[PDB]
Structure formats: C-alpha cells, structure tokens
C-alpha cells in the first residue's frame, strides 16, 4: 500500500523539541498495523523511535524528536510494506551553553564552561550525591538523591536534562514490581 | 538538649534581626550609579545575603545532626 | 500535505537563522538588515509570507508570529512602514503609509489561497480599505503597489468568488493604463495577470511594450518575475542569472541572497531575500521540467544563462559567458544516473540522491549543455603532547584510580560499581577512550551495578 | 529443491573479518525454512555457524566469518534438503603479532612476543585484574574488571579481541535475568 | 556566648565594609597600563576578591559550628 | 579569637600591597631584549608571583580551619 | 584530613608547573638530529612524561585509599 | 615538607641529565669491535638503561608515597 502525511511536519523546529505527525495508511483493510519512525542525520544512519500500532481507521498519530544536526531525515516505515522519508532542518544549538544565575534582579552571574569540564564536574557531583543518598536512605536513596543531584545540576550548567528520564524510567519499573508484589498471590 | 535549642533559637532570631542591615550594606556597595565592585564581584555581593541565609539554616542542621549521633 | 522543496527551505532557513529577532511590541518578526538591527518592516514580513505561502503549514509558528505582527501593525486597514528601535546613543513607530502595501495585500491573498482563513479575511479587509482609499483620490499611489493590488484582486476573485473584485480590477486596469526598472517589471507582471484573467489584447500590447523597453539585486528579481510572467526565456533567464551571480549557497542549509556584490555592504537585505526566493521558485515551477529543477548557478564574472528548454526528454541550457572560466550548476532531482554534455566533450558530474552538480569549463562563445536523464548507454560517471595510545593508557590509569579511591572511601560494592559507571562517563568526557570501549564498559557497569544491588 | 547465491561471496577477504551472503531457495512454498552455514578448513572439518530461518520470500541474508586458514569451505545447508559449498582463500595472518605503541608522535615503542608468552602474560594479568575486581566490587566486579583487563590487554599485544564477546555474552544473560526478576510475579 | 555572636557579626560587617579597599587595590593593579602584567596575573588578581568572599562567608559558618559545640 | 580574625584582613592588605613590588622586580629581571633569565628560568621566575598569590589566597583557608580546630 | 588535601593540592600544582621543563628536557635528549639515545631508549624517554603524569595521578589515589581505610 | 618535593624533583631532573653519560658508556661498551662480547652481554647492557629508567620513574612515586605518610 501507500502511506501519506495528514499533517505537515514543521520545518526548522527548535533544537531538542518534539512535533506530532499525522500519518495515514492506504489499503489497510480493517486492522491495526505496525510502524516505526527512523529519525537521524543522513538516510544511512537512522535511529529508530516511536513504535506503536495505528488505529483501525488507518491513521496513526506519533511524536518525532529533533536531533542536534543541521539535516535530519525522518522516515515513517510500515514495517514490511512501503515507507517514506522527509528532510527537516532543525536549528543547531551551540555545544557550549552559557547559564545566567539571577541574583537581586539586575545582577546576574553569567558563566559558561567547556562541555568536558562541565560533564566531569556533573559526574563527580552525581557520585557525591548518590553516595550520600546511599549512606542516608538506602538503595531507594540512590534513586532519590540521584534525582535531587541531577536537578541541582540542571539548575547549574551541567549534565543535560534527558538523563533524568533514565532514572525516571528505572524507578518506574521498580515501582511496578512492588505494586505487583502487593496484588497477586 | 534544651540549652542547645535555646541557643539556636536566639542565634536564628539574631540572624533574622540583622539580615536587613547586611542587605542594605550590600545594596550600598553594589546598587547605585557608583560602581564600587565590578560585575562578577557585584553579582557575588548580591549572592552573599542568600549565602548568609543558607548558613543560618545549615548551622542548626549540622549541629543537631552531630549532637543526636 | 505538500512539502517545501530544497531551495525554498534553504533560503527560508538561512533568513530565519540570521534575520529573526524581537519586535518592540513583543511578537517575533524579521528586521531589515543584519547591520541596522532596529527597523522592522511589515512589508518585509509580507514578502516572506509571499515567499513561503505555497508551503505555509511547514513554517506554521513563524507565519503565525508574522501574522500577529501584521495584525498589531495595522491601524484600520492600512499598514505602517516601520517599527523602529530608538537609537540610545508605548509605541515607537513611524505612522506613514507603507510602500508596496499592495504587495502586502498580494501576500495575504496568496496565503489565503492555500489555507489560513485568518490571512484570507485580513486580505479581504485590507483590500476593501485600500480600494476605498484609492477611489478617494484616483491613481495618486505607488504604481508597483497598484500592480500588486491588481494581482491580489485577481487572486481574491479566484478564491473567494465575490463578483465586485471583477469590476474593481477592470477599473484598476484603467489606472495601470493611466501610468524605473522595478516598477516597469511589476507593471508588466500585472499586465500579464490581467491578460491571463480577461484575455484582452491591449494588456498584451502594453506587456510586450514593457518587454521591448528592457546593482540593487531586488530589481533583477522583479525583472525575472516579470519575464517569467511574459514567457520570454532570454529575459527571464538573464535576470535570474544576474540574481544568481551574487548569492552564497552551500548544499545542506544556507542560501543567502546578497544585496550588492560590488557594494561593501553585501549582507542579507531582507527586502531582497524573500524576493529572490520567489524569483527562484517561480523560475523553477514555470520553466524547469517536472524532475530536473535548476535553482542555483555560480557564474563567475558576467556569465548569464540565456535559454532552458525541455526538448523531448532532454534538457538544453544555452548559456553565454566571458573569458572562459568555469560555472557551477546545481539541479534539484531524484534520479541518480544521467549524462551531461558540455558542447560535445561528455564531461563528468556530481550527483547526490537529491542534488546533482556540474562544474564544467565553458568556452567564451555561446555554449549548450545537454542533460539527458535516465539515458541509454550512459557515458558520464558519478565521481566527485600525548597521542591516542598514550591517552588510552592514561584513561586506564584514571579508571583504576577512581575505582580504587571510591572503594577506599566507601566499603560498599554498589557504590564501587556506580563509581565505575561514572568513571566510564568521566573518561569519555575527556575523550581519553574511543566510544566503543567506553560504551561497552558503561553498559557492563550498568548491568553489574543492578546485579550487585540485587545480590545484597 | 535447489539453493542459489544472489550475491557473490568476496574471495580473498581479510583474516578475521565477516561478509554477507544472499542465499535464496527454490520450491519453498510459502514458509520460512531452516539453514546452517558450515564454515571450515577442508570439507571434512566444518564448524557450524549462522543458524536462522529464511524469509517467506525464500531468500535469507546471513553473515559468514573467515577462519585463519589458506583454504576455507563455506557450505550453506537447508537442513534436510539440498546443500552447496564454495571455497574461499582468505589472507593468512601471521601467528606473531607486532604492536607499536606511539608516544610523542614520531617515536614508537615496537615489540612482538611469541604467542605462548603473550598468552600466559595475558592470562596472569586477567587473574590479577579479576581478583582485584572481586575484592573491590564483587561478583559483578568479576565481569566489569574482566572487561577492563581484557581491554588493557587488547591495548598491548595480548589475548585476542573475541574473548571479550565471551564475557559480553555472559553479562547479557545475567542482565536479562534481573530484568525478568523486576517484571513478573 | 553572645560575645562570639557579636564577634562573627562584626567580622562579616567589617569584611563587607573593607571589601571596597580590596577592589580598589585590585583595580589599580590590573587596570590599563598594568604593572602586574596582563594574563594569568590578572586572572589571579580578579580571583582574590572571589576567594576572599568565599572565606568571608564560610568562616562564620565554621566558627558558629565550633563555638556551639 | 577576633584578633586573629582582623589580622587576617591585615595580612590580606599587606600582601596585596606587597605584591606590586615583587612583580615589578620579577618583570625587570625577565624583561628586556637580552635579559639574563633565558627562557626556562624566565618561566619559573614568572611562576614565582603566581605561587606567591596562590599562598596569599590559601593562607586564609588554613587560618580559618585552624580556628575551627 | 584538611592538611593532607592541602599537601596533595600543592604537590599536584608543583607537578603541573614543572611538567613542561621535564618535557623540554626529554625533547632535547631525544628530539633533534643528535641521537643522544637509541630508538628503544628514545621511545622510553618519550614515555617518561606520561609516566610522570601517571605518578601525579596515582600518588594521591593511593594516599587517600590508605588514609580513609 | 617542600624540601623533599625539591629533593625528588632534583632527583628526576639530574637523572635525565646524567642519562646521556649512561648511554655513552653502554654504546662504547657494546658497539662495533665490542670488548664486552656480543650476545647475552649486549642484551643485558641495553637492558641497564631500561631498568634505570624504570627505577628513575618508580622511586619518586614510592618516595612521595612514604613522605606524605
């Protein structure tokens, strides 16, 4: 069959944002169908995102992120049948990030560090905070104080935000486990 | 101990009472047309009042944490 | 559902990346020049809207921003000229009527044709306002703005169906018959539009009179648009080549239209960059064939393309040049293999899966380039201190150092494997290890940390 | 039925590399079918690799390694029905390996040891590193410091690279276990 | 122990009062026609007030921590 | 107690007013078209004021921690 | 301990300060037309600066590992 | 304990300075028309500078480890 886009994908989006795509399939008889969105720089190097099954109508609504590259190819794949890709030119974000801590309104402490020293500083800070959390609370203290330390790093110019989600993933599974352990036999 | 709590209470009250004079002095040094301190230094002075508040809120904390043991 | 092509995307991307800032009132919009940084021309944003109208849904946020800017930059139905930032060495904006505001009406109408009902209502309201203002005097307005008004009225009658527009343009036609290079170009463009809508000979007579009558790049862009409307390959190709002589293009992102090559202030004047985009896309959509779309050409000195004809299944480019030298043509295409022919020497070429590029050497006299897509018996080809080991040793030493230090400070093993994880991270931060070993050890440390947490 | 090769296998490949083969079957009705690639020196001594099932189209894409022998027979087997083999002459790699550690650009410490002394040195180094890892971290420390020590051996002229994959296999299973232990009841 | 309270409070007030003198000396040493030589010397000279502020804000915390022990 | 605290500021002031002469001396010893300092001894001599100011900065921390214990 | 940290800091700073002289001496011995040291020896001298860096980064490590106990 | 710092630094600098003498003696003993006899003697003679460098780089580490203890 053929696949089409019911919504125009926004060209030139911000660096690390996301956008919705409205992709609808053709000769889908009545059943949900698989799809995958390979997004990446250059058609050869694609990173897969957005698994899921489209609705019985044949239209699926998906979320696509934007990489930190000048040219990004986004390829909707039916997983077996026809596929299609389109190119997007997201705004590039500079490697060095400058952070301004505002104190007493007008005065602002502005500073920017090279990415390597910022990464190592954030890593050592995460070590210290996770060790303190382990000493204080325990194995759950590891996760709690990791979240706290990564928050305090995000407040400064340090480790990026998405690292949080990693921890936020790992907690979730653990939570599920305990809930299950309190439900069945 | 009761004595430690009383001392911490009076210390916190003293900190609250003479916070405004410290803030006014910092503003006199930094705020205004006269640049007594350069940008980085001026931002540092604007940070000092909060560092002072942090000291007022951490000193009883470490005191209790070490005392209870 | 349509997607913008590469040339339009490149031009708009360059303009947005370079010419996007904060207006005095709050809505983000385009300023005029890279150096001026103060003036915000609503006419300029109208030009950008004209450039980006056919693929409006792609740049939804920017179009919404500039539409809000236009909404707050209109008094009743007529737009103001500038929103100036005061020079330091509550509204701050000169209230004079904006030149080429008929261009604004045309841009809003073009936006309305493809959607954006807000833009269509805006175009109708401003149409009524300016038509009443013109009927108040007669023909005492800017002439190019009047021509763009006739174009906007034609579009509005095309997409709205209201009959009054018809009568209006007829009267407006008389006004244009009642009356520089750029104004002559717009007058001829409106002549051609009037002929296309009403098929009256006198409009063609005036248009060919302007044709026979024929620095500051934009004038060349209006000339190319006029020639595209007429259908003269020679004039339109010459004007678009003059346009291309002073543009900076790289393959992935940038497509910048300079305002003057000889002038010191080349820069990117916002008055011309959307005009250049419109000229390029008009030339491609009209004269280029379905697949092989020529949008950029680096012609050194005063070399100019004369003709571009799709004869049968082969494209012919007739080009004139001076003092030999090499020109470089870039074609938007999908096919991978096809053969080019400069004179009769079978030169080679470069072709990605979306862009092909030829860089041949041309003779002083007129020369013909024949591009045959999907050809039989293809001839042309598709060709175009410390060191690492020391750093790796230092990385191994650092890794063992931090692991041992962590184990010494805290006797727990879970903290130790977590420190191994963070040590992989640190040694990657300093680029002491290749990403392969760093990632392998990081994943191993992750799984071993979770195993150690489980085993406690 | 009959089996055929849709892609020509590269004769004379490097010593320890791999290549893809494109093998398609005949009278396969509509179902996936098993296959196995017996690769080895001389047709009598074949070592089996590349299990898997071909696609319903009847074409399977497989990876074949190259042994350190002058003549290698690669035999695609349908596992029951017809089979076919072809011979390849890979480039032989010398038993003694010479390693050059570059320091300060031009100067390079070059050395090469006999395979037996290199093997015993790497083995003793692996002992020391694995014991240190066990003392420091624990049972997971065994795997982590084994990976680290084998990396530091690969940096020198020592134990070959593929040993890593062994450990990289054994970790994987363990990881799977813990994931399962955090999912079900 | 209010005598030490007054001692640290006078310490911090006097430090902020005298800080303009330190800034004046640093600026005179590192301004145009610099006799301290521009480069790492200027960076260290600008660092002196920063670490001086760090000391001025850390030493009251540690003094209060010790005196109530 | 407070005597050494104010002596810390006195020492900081005396150090910041004693640096301009030692830096002038080292610059005079290292400057010129053909100075008798060569290139390596020149680097060490230039580093000497850097270590001096590093000591000037570190000493307040040592005094503060001595007062702590 | 604070004293151990201060000593380690000054030792690391000294190592950083007089690393370049060691590197220059090694280059003078090895680099250049004059072969003061043969190939294997010359490679050894080119390795010495990194061995020196390794010593600077391992000595505090073993110190802390033994001290914390 | 800066005296020992200077001691080890002078140790390593003097070792690298005097190493050319060791190389000269070894080369004179093991070059053509060798009086030390070619064979295992030559291998050991070439090994002397290598283990000398090993000592010259290991003994500062152990001395620094012991002195800060």
From TrEMBL, chains A, D:
The species this protein was found in: Sulfolobus spindle-shaped virus SSV19
Domain of life, source organism: Viruses
Full protein name: Uncharacterized protein
Lineage start: Viruses, Viruses incertae sedis, Fuselloviridae, Betafusellovirus
UniProtKB/TrEMBL annotation, chains B, E, F, G, H:
Protein origin, superkingdom: Viruses
Protein name per its UniProtKB record: VP1
Record organism: Sulfolobus spindle-shaped virus SSV19
Automatic annotation (TrEMBL), chain C:
Protein name: VP4
Domain of life assignment: Viruses
């Amino acid at each position: 069959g053929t696949i089409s886009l019911l919504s125009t994908p926004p060209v030139n989006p911000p660096a690390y944002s996301y956008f919705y795509i409205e992709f609808q399939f053709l000769p889908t008889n009545n059943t949900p169908q698989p799809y995958a969105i390979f997004v990446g720089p250059n058609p050869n190097n694609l990173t897969e995102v957005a698994e899921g099954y489209t609705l019985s109508n044949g239209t699926g609504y998906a979320r696509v992120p934007v990489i930190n590259a000048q040219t990004e190819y986004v390829d909707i794949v039916w997983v077996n049948q026809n596929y299609t890709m389109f190119e997007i030119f997201p705004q590039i974000q500079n490697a060095t990030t400058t952070v301004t801590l505002s104190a007493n309104n007008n005065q602002g402490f502005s500073f920017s560090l090279p990415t390597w020293v910022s990464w190592v500083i954030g890593a050592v800070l995460m070590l210290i905070f996770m060790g303190v959390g382990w000493k204080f609370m325990g194995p759950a203290g590891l996760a709690i104080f990791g979240i706290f330390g990564l928050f305090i790093a995000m407040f400064f110019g340090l480790l990026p935000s998405y690292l949080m989600y990693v921890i936020l993933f790992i907690v979730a599974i653990v939570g599920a486990r305990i809930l299950t352990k309190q439900l069945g036999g | 101990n009761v004595g430690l709590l009383i001392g911490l209470f009076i210390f916190i009250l003293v900190g609250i009472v003479l916070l405004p004079v410290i803030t006014s002095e910092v503003s006199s040094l930094t705020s205004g047309t006269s640049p007594a301190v350069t940008g980085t230094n001026a931002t540092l002075l604007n940070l000092v009042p909060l560092f002072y508040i942090l000291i007022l809120v951490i000193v009883p904390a470490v005191l209790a944490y070490k005392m209870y043991r | 559902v349509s997607l913008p092509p590469l040339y339009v995307e490149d031009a708009v991307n360059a303009e947005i990346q370079q010419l996007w800032s904060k207006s005095p009132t709050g809505v983000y919009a385009f300023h005029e020049a890279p150096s001026v940084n103060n003036s915000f021309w609503p006419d300029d944003n109208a030009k950008f809207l004209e450039s980006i109208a056919p693929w409006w849904q792609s740049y939804s946020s920017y179009v919404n921003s500039t539409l809000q800017f236009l909404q707050q930059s209109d008094v009743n139905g007529l737009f103001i000229k500038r929103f100036e930032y005061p020079l330091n060495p509550w509204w701050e904006a000169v209230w004079g009527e904006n030149y080429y505001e008929g261009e604004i009406i045309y841009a809003l109408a073009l936006l309305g044709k493809y959607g954006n009902s807000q833009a269509l209502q805006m175009a109708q309201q401003a149409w009524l306002s300016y038509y009443n203002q013109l009927k108040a005097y007669n023909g005492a307005t800017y002439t190019s703005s009047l021509a763009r008004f006739i174009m906007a009225t034609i579009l509005l009658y095309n997409i709205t169906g209201n009959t009054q527009y018809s009568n209006a343009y007829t009267q407006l036609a008389n006004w244009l018959l009642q009356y520089f290079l750029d104004i002559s170009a717009m007058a001829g463009q409106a002549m051609m539009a009037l002929y296309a809508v009403t098929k009256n000979i006198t409009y063609l007579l005036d248009a060919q009179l302007v044709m026979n009558a024929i620095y500051y790049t934009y004038k060349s862009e209006l000339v190319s648009e006029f020639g595209d409307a007429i259908g003269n390959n020679t004039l339109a190709s010459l004007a678009i080549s003059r346009v291309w002589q002073r543009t900076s293009y790289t393959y992935p992102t940038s497509y910048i239209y300079y305002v003057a090559r000889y002038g010191s202030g080349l820069q990117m004047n916002s008055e011309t960059q959307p005009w250049g985009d419109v000229a390029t896309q008009f030339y491609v959509n009209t004269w280029s064939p379905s697949n092989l779309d020529l949008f950029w050409a680096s012609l050194p000195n005063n070399n100019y393309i004369t003709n571009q004809t799709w004869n049968g299944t082969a494209l012919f480019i007739h080009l004139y040049a001076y003092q030999q030298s090499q020109v470089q043509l870039i074609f938007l295409t999908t096919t991978v293999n096809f053969n080019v022919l400069v004179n009769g020497n079978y030169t080679n070429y470069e072709a990605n899966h979306q862009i092909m590029q030829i860089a041949p050497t041309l003779e002083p006299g007129p020369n013909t380039i024949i591009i045959i897509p999907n050809p039989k018996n293809q001839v042309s080809q598709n060709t175009n201190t410390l060191t690492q080991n020391e750093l790796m040793l230092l990385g191994f030493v650092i890794y063992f150092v931090i692991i041992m230090v962590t184990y010494g400070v805290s006797r727990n093993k879970t903290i130790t494997v977590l420190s191994s994880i963070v040590a992989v991270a640190i040694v990657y931060a300093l680029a002491l290890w290749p990403t392969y070993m760093a990632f392998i050890l990081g994943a191993v440390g992750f799984f071993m940390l979770f195993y150690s947490i489980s085993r406690r």
